[PDB]
Amino acid sequence: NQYDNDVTVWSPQGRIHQIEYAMEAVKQGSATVGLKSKTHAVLVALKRAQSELAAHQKKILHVDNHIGISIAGLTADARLLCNFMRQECLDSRFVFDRPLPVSRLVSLIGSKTQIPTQRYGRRPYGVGLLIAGYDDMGPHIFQTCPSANYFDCRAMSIGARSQSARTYLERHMSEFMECNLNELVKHGLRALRETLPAEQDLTTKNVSIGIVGKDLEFTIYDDDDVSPFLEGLEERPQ
Amino acid sequence: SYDRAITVFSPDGHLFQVEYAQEAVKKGSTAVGVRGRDIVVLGVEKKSVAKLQDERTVRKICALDDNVCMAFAGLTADARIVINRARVECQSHRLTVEDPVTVEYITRYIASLKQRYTQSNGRRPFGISALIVGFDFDGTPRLYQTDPSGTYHAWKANAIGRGAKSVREFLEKNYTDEAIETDDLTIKLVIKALLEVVQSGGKNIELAVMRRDQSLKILNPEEIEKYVAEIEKEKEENEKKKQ
Amino acid sequence: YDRGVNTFSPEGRLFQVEYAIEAIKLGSTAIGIQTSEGVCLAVEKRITSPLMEPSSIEKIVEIDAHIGCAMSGLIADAKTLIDKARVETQNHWFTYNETMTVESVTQAVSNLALQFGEEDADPGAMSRPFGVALLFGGVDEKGPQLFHMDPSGTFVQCDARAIGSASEGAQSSLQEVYHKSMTLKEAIKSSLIILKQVMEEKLNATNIELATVQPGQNFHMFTKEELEEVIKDI
Amino acid sequence: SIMSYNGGAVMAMKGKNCVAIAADRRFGIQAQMVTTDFQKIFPMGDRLYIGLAGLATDVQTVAQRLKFRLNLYELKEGRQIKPYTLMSMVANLLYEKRFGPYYTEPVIAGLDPKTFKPFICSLDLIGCPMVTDDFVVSGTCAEQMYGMCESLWEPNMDPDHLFETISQAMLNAVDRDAVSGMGVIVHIIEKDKITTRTLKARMD
Amino acid sequence: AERGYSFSLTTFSPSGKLVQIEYALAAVAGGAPSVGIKAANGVVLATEKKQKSILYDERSVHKVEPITKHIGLVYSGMGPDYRVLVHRARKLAQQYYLVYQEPIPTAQLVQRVASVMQEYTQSGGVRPFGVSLLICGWNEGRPYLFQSDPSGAYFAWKATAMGKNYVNGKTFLEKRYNEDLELEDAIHTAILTLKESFEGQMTEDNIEVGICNEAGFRRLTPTEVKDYLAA
Amino acid sequence: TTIAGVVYKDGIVLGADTRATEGMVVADKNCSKIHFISPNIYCCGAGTAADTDMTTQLISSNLELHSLSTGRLPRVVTANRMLKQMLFRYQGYIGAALVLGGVDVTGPHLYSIYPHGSTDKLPYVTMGSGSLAAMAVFEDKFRPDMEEEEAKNLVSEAIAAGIFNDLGSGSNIDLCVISKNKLDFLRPYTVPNKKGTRLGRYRCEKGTTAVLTEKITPLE
Amino acid sequence: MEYLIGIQGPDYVLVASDRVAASNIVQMKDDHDKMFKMSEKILLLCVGEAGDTVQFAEYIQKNVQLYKMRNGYELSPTAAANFTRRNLADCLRSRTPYHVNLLLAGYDEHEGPALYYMDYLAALAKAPFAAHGYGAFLTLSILDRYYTPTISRERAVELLRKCLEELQKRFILNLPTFSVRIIDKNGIHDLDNISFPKQ
Amino acid sequence: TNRIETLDPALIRPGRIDRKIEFPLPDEKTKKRIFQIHTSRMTLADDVTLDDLIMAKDDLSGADIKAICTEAGLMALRERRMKVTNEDFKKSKENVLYK
Amino acid sequence: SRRYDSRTTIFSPEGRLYQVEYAMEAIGHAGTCLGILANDGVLLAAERRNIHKLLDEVFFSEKIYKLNEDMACSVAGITSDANVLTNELRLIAQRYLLQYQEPIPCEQLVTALCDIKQAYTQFGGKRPFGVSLLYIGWDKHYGFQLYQSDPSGNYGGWKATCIGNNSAAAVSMLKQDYKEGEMTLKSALALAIKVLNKTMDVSKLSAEKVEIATLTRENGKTVIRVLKQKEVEQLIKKHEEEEAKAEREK
Ligand SMILES: Nc1ncnc2c1ncn2[C@@H]1O[C@H](COP(=O)(O)OP(=O)(O)O)[C@@H](O)[C@H]1O
């Protein structure tokens, strides 16, 4: 309990508890799933509402024309990092007149988020990201943790009850690389669906989809723009 | 510099340093104020009459401008700081704006200053409460009060310091449109209220009054004795000749 | 024991932010209703004495001519955010020659969310979160909008929302009576009704404050008489 | 010139066990006189005077900051200042603004508060100190004062002869300088007393 | 990366004591003893420079240090801290000399040094110095002997002792010493009061002596100390 | 101003004149231009007077610290380093021209230091308005490994050349002789100049100056 | 260009100033006031650069008022004068110097009436009478001619009229009207304007 | 307890300890009852005025007052006196309070 | 860092600042120092704790600091902190002089130092100054003055008061003996010797144990003088010869 309250304190067993507790903040967020073909990168996110008379939290954010993100955790830290990423992208376009490669943006986020895990009284960023992007090396889905670690994923899911989605995605990886966009978004929607009890299901009110690709700037669909994707699914029955 | 959070939230959602500050206020000499028509009176209780003491050097009623006076209860040093800052701001208002200072404005300044000290690293809340009293241009008389939290409100009459609940009850029951119909009657009301907490004297009551565009007037203990005398007389010509 | 203001709980939460949320539960309750005819905001004043001039209680303020704000909790902390909001709206008008969208103002105020911390910061930076909940009620190009904000910095659009001590009760009551086609009259009426239900003192003209923003009319705080005309129809 | 903007003249002179410091009294802006009683000589202790000519603003400001430092010195240590030490203190103060200097050329005159041995000195605008056993001058009529003091000054003078000497020197030097004069004031200081006199001078 | 702790480590106890200062004083009263005598025509400082082995070269470090040409220093307590204070005292002395072109008065150097010591009882993140200083000086004909302690307080002495057994040394001084003493006799009684503790054979390399007359401060050579220790 | 410096077999002879001028008037007739730096290091100063005074005081201070700390004698290289770095840092805005000389563990050493921060180590140097006269004297009558009295004579001769051929120089001649174990701060060496005796007595008699006002203040 | 003038009597200070606010070749204002109350017994007459006069004067004013609110008694005209002179002198070598010429008139209950003259270089000089402006060159001598230290305030006003009439006759600048104030034991009194009814 | 800041909340909580009562340190009236009560049961010089004592100390509690009452007793018993005077209380006040 | 922070600038749950209170306790254990105002002057008289056979006496005093040509102060508590505060007082007074070219009014000097002490109580995390002061002075506004300040930065004016060990006894004695409007330097000196004689633990009282300073007004100048040991012995003898006189009456 004396190794619990500070990020600068290694535990006698080789761990840092504030980082792990910070990582637990990612599981508190509604689930989100991200998968790629060979040409497209798709984020699908289960939005989420406090009361029925409140709108749903937005979960996919636009960074640059070629990069969008899905958030899971503290929304304030999310917006912090999001502003940083947008600024870096604009700096890149300003100085080089070329879009910033996704892997470099991610590296910058790693650098930025590593710093407060090493200084006293600083706290790690309480937010996990899925980053969907397209550059000269194709589509990309990246994952960032509060530990400031990042991973290049072929598909991924984070948030509460995202283990299910992780399993489903782990089954259908072999299909994804050749899927068409509609099928890709479908797979993402199914992955997202397995993260719910049989009582509740997908709607045009609690689902956001985000696509970026070789012939498509990053775009967010929600409300009625999602309906053409959903109305095309197998009513998975218990 | 020292960058440590002193005032933070408690698990029940309270700011404990602010509460202890308010305790410090609760240990203060009693101060009350009532608002009249053409007079506003503030009176402060125990002057700690040590008799070998210069009263002038321990007054708890200061003037912020020709327009606004103020009383306080709590930690005298913190009060001195807040008072001086408020004075500076009262003047800088006249620099930046040819119009003078309104009591609400300076109240707002003081309030914000205290709140700032409740939410800055390193700092500790000022442990005072203030009764800000004045007459604004347009002639409406005004009395506001602040708190170590930074909250502020207007009052018709109020009390702060040791036994503020008692005086407040009394003032609740005795503030009428009949009382404070004359200056002599508002002052009388304040002396009546202050005698209900004070150590029973009259040499232990300071009363200051402000009226129209005239300056602050502090009462010498002769006049105070006279008022407490008419008080005791009416307390024996309308309370003796009845019961 | 003493931990920092920037500590996580093993459950994944900043204790300061949670504690602040707790601190809201002590504030006076407030109700906001969004409607295609405008947005209404009501709050109880909670006067602690007949001696206290109730007109010096403003838990409803104008951020700008088309954006109003109702606050619950530590009012002193609210003042800072309100000022920052006003300045922000005016800077956006200054720079771009157009009013701020309610969502943009809301976001701006919400950026001062988790901006607290001890070491590695300015000597005049915040020591703790803001112990206040806000309801921003405005009108813009998307029409009438209402947002809610808490010390977590999460802000969210709401159709009808209650903040304060009687948040739960009033919110349930709101759910029972809200539909996306009410008139502003029905909204105000409903608000005053629920408010009367939850208020400890008897509801009257100098006991709550009420304000509307309609598309054609700037932010309007209801006078005593205008309140009386509504309370009459109990 | 900047130094000629206000004009003015200050002289100090050694005697036997005595010392003298004089100055004109004009405060003038270029050709025009504004006042005839302007102070140029400041007491920095009993039996220690500093004489400031030059630009009147820096006269006043150097005098004032010098009094600042001096008061502090006399409080920290339990003694009046020695003249050497005052000289070095002034020098320091002037050199602090080496690249935007005060336009004053001070003259110090005073008796060692332990002994009685007279001390006189002068400094640059940037505080180069210069001690003599005869006299020191500063101002717009420096040449004149040098000319008179080289021809009038004898070594071991008694207070009356120091007086006559410094008075005639100041008067005749100053009366051939357009922007100095409007009166002369002369402080002759000895172990036992301090005599201050104002001479009859031309007012043109 | 690094900053500085900003809070005081020296704080009032409920009794009203600055505990860290008294514990620093405990560190002083655990160091080798030093005696200082002001003697009409000069000042004597002496201290026990007793090493722990034939291996240590006694001609390498000294405990009696000059601050200027007319002021000298000895200490009791922790060595390193003394070193720091001596550097700082030399610096202060030279500041004063730059400004007044007159060697710093002993009282003023004592004041300044004491101020430095007091800073580390109120500035953040530090402990007080574990050193008592004896400062001798010649200024204005008279001789001067001051002591400064870790609190930053200073006292003028005719004679005193610091370090281990400083109480008995102090009493011995109160009895077996008085005014009208020449520097020679003062050196004598200084070595005499140091001998009231020096467990072992007091050699010319076991103790260090400094004098301060109206010819300047100086350390006595080992030869001179041998000649004096022939008594 | 005429300052000169020479290296002889056992050490160093510095020389200077004593006039300080403000414009084309002599302001000081007995200015001291040879500054104490350390017991074994002395420095003649020409150029901006204030700057040579304060430069040389600063350096004296830091070197006193340095010897106090080292427990040894300062080296002349140390003074040269300190001066030349400080001077370069100020880009010649500090008008110090110096002749720095002394005796070390390594022997005698004479540097000339120019305001921009350049130095030269030389057997004989001159600086100031009278420097080229003195340099002529050196270039005509200098030989290596001179003895003390010869070097004193040579230096005084160069300073004299300066005095009589430069209007910026005048009055007396000051010498400073520094050897491995002696320091002769002769001041003044030889005054080749005297004010002529006053032929007349312009003595003013008491009361000859008119007074308006008097004020006696008794002291103690 | 601006005119100021001050005449100290045995127990009063008379001050007078032109009322023209001018720009380019035109008078834009003819009822402009050059004077500033600092205390109940102190007047500050400021003249000079466009922005510096009011900025400086108002700064000084606020600081004097602050002293009064902080200490309960008012500053003496001498303390005030040295205060303004310190502030003016500190800014002289700074990035933001103040080109102001000033008079400071006042009355102390102890030391009596006082008149201070300040150049824009911030040099402080006590005088029985002074003036600022080009007009001063034509008026000072008149004062020298007709000022006596025992002058009554009636005679003072008359003398002032002499100066102002001289201005009317010789000076090329217009200057038709003059604010006239007098400070004594009882405070600041406004006297009727000295004017020369041109048009 | 005198200091309630050093009690475990578990003991203070209600259930365990409900009513929490404070004991203020007289003032000017209570003391009168305290003084009158302590000097009313003895040969207290009807000359002096308990007031002098009441307005004497700064914040003296209900003890100090009793000590002064008793002090005189010993004073009384000292110089052999059945009826204390003034100084007796004075010496007491200065003998107890001060010291 | 959160661990080692003693938190000095923080409220206690009853509403008090612990370090300030404790500092007052520190003050209680310092040398007694008292001050009496009169109509023709004002005086400070203090117990000397530096009373040992080997002390050399190189300063004009021990507990009486001269701050300004019109004004002087005495101290009680930690002496080094007193050196700090006295230095700063000097600076303040000389700054006022540089700004206004006239001496600083005593109240403003006291307030100026008290704002420093208060500052130390409110922020920074440093310990407060364990020092109380008495200030004596004169100014052209309120004439002779006596003030007192505590480590909370809180100050007040008195006609007579005491500070340090056995302060309260001394205060009570002064409440008995003082003479509003009827005080002289002579009478006040008597009172000083009396109260000092009773409050000092070591009775009989030698001049080696006390330090007396008076501040008086002579011909437009302000004089501050520390009484030579001879005059002090005269005062003491006078006290005993008055005390043996009132004991005859029985
Ligand atoms: N007002 C009072 N009335 C009666 N007795 C008192 C009063 N004040 C003090 N005492 C006496 O002094 C003693 C104080 O004891 P107590 O009140 O228990 O103090 P504590 O709680 O500190 O021990 C009691 O025994 C009581 O007899």
Short mmCIF file of C-alpha atoms in Angstrom, two decimals, chain E residues 120-220:
data_model
loop_
_atom_site.label_atom_id
_atom_site.label_comp_id
_atom_site.label_asym_id
_atom_site.label_seq_id
_atom_site.Cartn_x
_atom_site.Cartn_y
_atom_site.Cartn_z
CA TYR E 120 19.92 26.81 5.93
CA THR E 121 17.45 26.73 8.85
CA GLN E 122 14.67 28.28 6.78
CA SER E 123 15.37 27.57 3.08
CA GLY E 124 13.96 24.42 1.70
CA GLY E 125 15.21 20.93 1.51
CA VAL E 126 18.27 21.23 3.63
CA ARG E 127 19.75 20.54 7.04
CA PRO E 128 21.60 23.14 9.11
CA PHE E 129 25.39 23.11 9.20
CA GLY E 130 26.86 20.93 11.88
CA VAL E 131 29.55 23.38 12.71
CA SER E 132 30.45 25.97 15.30
CA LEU E 133 32.93 28.55 14.13
CA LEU E 134 35.44 30.60 16.06
CA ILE E 135 36.45 33.69 14.14
CA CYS E 136 39.36 35.81 15.18
CA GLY E 137 40.18 39.23 13.77
CA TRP E 138 42.29 42.35 14.05
CA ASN E 139 40.51 45.60 13.19
CA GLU E 140 40.70 49.14 14.61
CA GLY E 141 43.52 48.39 17.06
CA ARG E 142 41.39 46.04 19.18
CA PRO E 143 41.30 42.21 18.75
CA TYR E 144 38.06 40.30 18.10
CA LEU E 145 36.83 36.84 18.90
CA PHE E 146 33.42 35.66 17.82
CA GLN E 147 31.61 32.40 17.75
CA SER E 148 28.80 31.45 15.37
CA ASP E 149 26.58 28.43 15.93
CA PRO E 150 24.35 26.43 13.47
CA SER E 151 21.28 28.47 14.43
CA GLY E 152 23.08 31.42 12.88
CA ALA E 153 23.49 33.20 16.18
CA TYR E 154 26.80 34.75 17.15
CA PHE E 155 28.48 35.87 20.33
CA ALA E 156 31.55 37.86 21.20
CA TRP E 157 33.93 36.10 23.62
CA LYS E 158 37.02 37.00 25.59
CA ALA E 159 37.70 33.31 25.55
CA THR E 160 35.82 30.13 24.87
CA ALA E 161 35.94 26.52 23.88
CA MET E 162 33.88 24.37 21.55
CA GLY E 163 33.65 20.69 20.70
CA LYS E 164 33.99 17.78 23.12
CA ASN E 165 34.41 18.67 26.77
CA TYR E 166 33.75 22.30 25.98
CA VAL E 167 32.18 22.85 29.39
CA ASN E 168 35.28 21.85 31.38
CA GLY E 169 37.46 23.77 28.94
CA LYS E 170 35.22 26.76 29.48
CA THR E 171 35.50 26.57 33.28
CA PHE E 172 39.28 26.08 33.04
CA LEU E 173 39.37 29.24 30.91
CA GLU E 174 37.21 31.12 33.42
CA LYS E 175 39.68 30.33 36.18
CA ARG E 176 43.15 29.95 34.68
CA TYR E 177 42.86 32.93 32.34
CA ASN E 178 42.27 36.65 32.44
CA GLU E 179 43.00 39.95 30.73
CA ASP E 180 46.32 41.80 30.43
CA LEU E 181 47.70 38.63 28.79
CA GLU E 182 50.17 38.95 25.97
CA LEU E 183 49.62 36.74 22.91
CA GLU E 184 52.46 34.46 24.07
CA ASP E 185 50.84 33.77 27.44
CA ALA E 186 47.52 33.30 25.62
CA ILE E 187 49.04 30.70 23.33
CA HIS E 188 50.35 29.06 26.45
CA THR E 189 46.98 28.88 28.21
CA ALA E 190 45.35 27.81 24.92
CA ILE E 191 47.62 24.80 24.55
CA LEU E 192 47.06 24.33 28.29
CA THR E 193 43.26 24.16 27.93
CA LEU E 194 43.57 21.95 24.85
CA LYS E 195 45.74 19.60 26.94
CA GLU E 196 42.79 19.17 29.33
CA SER E 197 41.40 16.72 26.73
CA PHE E 198 44.07 15.70 24.21
CA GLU E 199 44.16 11.98 25.02
CA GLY E 200 47.72 11.03 24.07
CA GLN E 201 51.07 12.69 23.44
CA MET E 202 50.38 16.19 22.15
CA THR E 203 52.81 16.56 19.24
CA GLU E 204 53.46 19.43 16.89
CA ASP E 205 51.35 17.67 14.26
CA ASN E 206 48.52 16.68 16.62
CA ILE E 207 47.34 20.28 17.10
CA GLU E 208 47.03 23.37 14.98
CA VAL E 209 47.42 26.93 16.19
CA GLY E 210 46.71 30.27 14.63
CA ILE E 211 47.39 33.77 15.88
CA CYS E 212 46.00 37.18 15.02
CA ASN E 213 47.86 40.24 16.15
CA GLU E 214 48.07 43.68 14.60
CA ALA E 215 50.49 42.25 12.03
CA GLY E 216 47.86 40.01 10.37
CA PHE E 217 46.41 36.53 10.93
CA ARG E 218 48.68 33.55 10.48
CA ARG E 219 48.98 29.88 11.17
CA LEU E 220 51.84 28.93 13.50
#
